[PDB]
Design a protein around this ligand. Structure first.
Ligand SMILES: [Cl-]
Ligand SMILES: [Cl-]
Ligand code: NA
Length: 130
């Protein structure tokens, strides 16, 4: 499913992402935008280390979910990576919450540092009623 901006913003708020571990809703929106373009079925194979990024938040199979083909991988979210390809993003949000519970926080995603960190991210939630 390809979410529309405000539709996603309202959904994330209801799932309790606003201010989770100090991360504002607009930062989560900026992250989803640059990671998948708000697309839940997005997958990206990384030929370099044989891991794959799954879903709206492009969560990596080496640490967070299990796809069985990634070498030396763990499954911290204790989910099948298939769970992160659903239209319903409940499981993806629960795993994202797990990711930021680690010391790096939102910085775990390099794309966040490149396209969101230290920028005016207000535009991602403007007019959405959140
Ligand atoms: Cl699962
Ligand atoms: Cl599994
Ligand atoms: Na894994």
């Amino acid at each position: 499913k390809v979410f529309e901006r405000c539709e996603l913003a309202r959904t994330l708020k209801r799932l309790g992402m606003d201010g989770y571990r100090g991360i504002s809703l607009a930062n989560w929106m900026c992250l989803a935008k640059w990671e998948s373009g708000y697309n839940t079925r997005a997958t990206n194979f990384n030929a370099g280390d044989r891991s794959t990024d799954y879903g709206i938040f492009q969560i990596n199979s080496r640490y967070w979910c299990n796809d069985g083909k990634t070498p030396g991988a763990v499954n911290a979210c204790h989910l099948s990576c298939s769970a992160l390809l659903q239209d319903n993003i409940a499981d993806a949000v629960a795993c994202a919450k797990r990711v930021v519970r680690d010391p790096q926080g939102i910085r775990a995603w390099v794309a966040w540092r490149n396209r969101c960190q230290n920028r005016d991210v207000r535009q991602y939630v403007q007019g959405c009623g959140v």
